[PDB]
Amino acid sequence: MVLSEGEWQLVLHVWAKVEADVAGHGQDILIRLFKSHPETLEKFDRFKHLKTEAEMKASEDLKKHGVTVLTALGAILKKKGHHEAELKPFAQSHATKHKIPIKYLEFISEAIIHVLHSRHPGNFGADAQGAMNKALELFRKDIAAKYKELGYQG
Ligand code: HEM
């Protein structure tokens, strides 16, 4: 798929707001993921023990990882589709080391959209949400293809 330039502008306009607080957004997104789809927490040996939202919110480690996650995602989105190099090491670790199926990448996509909708309603109307969904769909399609090349196809 190909996004148009106007679709990329909508994506990068709300992302610029996200970047004003990368740690806060990273926390909100991982907590939303783990609350909505508890099975995903099981993939993280470092966080598997956390029992409640309060414990998750209190975790310095979780917040640090949320920064790592959004920083990587931001690098990919800023490439506006030209992200082949960025995708390779992500794909290899998530396919071979962490063993993360495509369905769980759909779940985190849903988490990202929920948090942006809650925090940025004025910059995340219907058109902006459709553009972010398309950007994430593009991401997931390219990762599924790389998964297959790598021998996992998740
Ligand atoms: C937007 C999607 C995601 C991005 C950008 C992302 C990015 C990253 C990055 C940069 C790392 C550290 C380097 C590495 O090991 O590759 C990482 C580690 C990891 N990721 Fe992801 N991730 C994403 C989605 C997921 C999902 C959905 C899961 C599981 C449900 C997951 C599970 C893990 C695990 C288990 C680790 C290792 C944590 C540790 O023990 O340090 N990732 N991810």
From Swiss-Prot:
Keywords (A to Z) from UniProt: Cytoplasm, Heme, Iron, Metal-binding, Muscle protein, Oxidoreductase, Oxygen transport, Phosphoprotein, Transport
Entry-annotated residues carrying Phosphoserine: 4
Effect of residue 122 to A: In metmyoglobin
Subcellular localization: Cytoplasm, Sarcoplasm
Record-linked Gene3D superfamilies: 6.10.140.2100, 6.10.140.2110
Positions with a binding annotation for nitrite: 65
Binding-site positions, O2: 65
Family annotation (InterPro entries): Globin (IPR000971), Globin-like_sf (IPR009050), Myoglobin (IPR002335)
Gene Ontology molecular function: any one: oxygen carrier activity
Major subcellular location class: cytoplasm
PROSITE patterns in the record: GLOBIN
Enzyme superclass (EC): oxidoreductase
Residue ranges occupied by any Globin domain in the UniProt entry: 2-148
GO BP terms: removal of superoxide radicals
Biological role: Monomeric heme protein which primary function is to store oxygen and facilitate its diffusion within muscle tissues. Reversibly binds oxygen through a pentacoordinated heme iron and enables its timely and efficient release as needed during periods of heightened demand. Depending on the oxidative conditions of tissues and cells, and in addition to its ability to bind oxygen, it also has a nitrite reductase activity whereby it regulates the production of bioactive nitric oxide.
Similarity comment: Belongs to the globin family.
Assembly behavior: Monomeric.
Record-given protein name: Myoglobin
Organism encoding this protein: Physeter macrocephalus
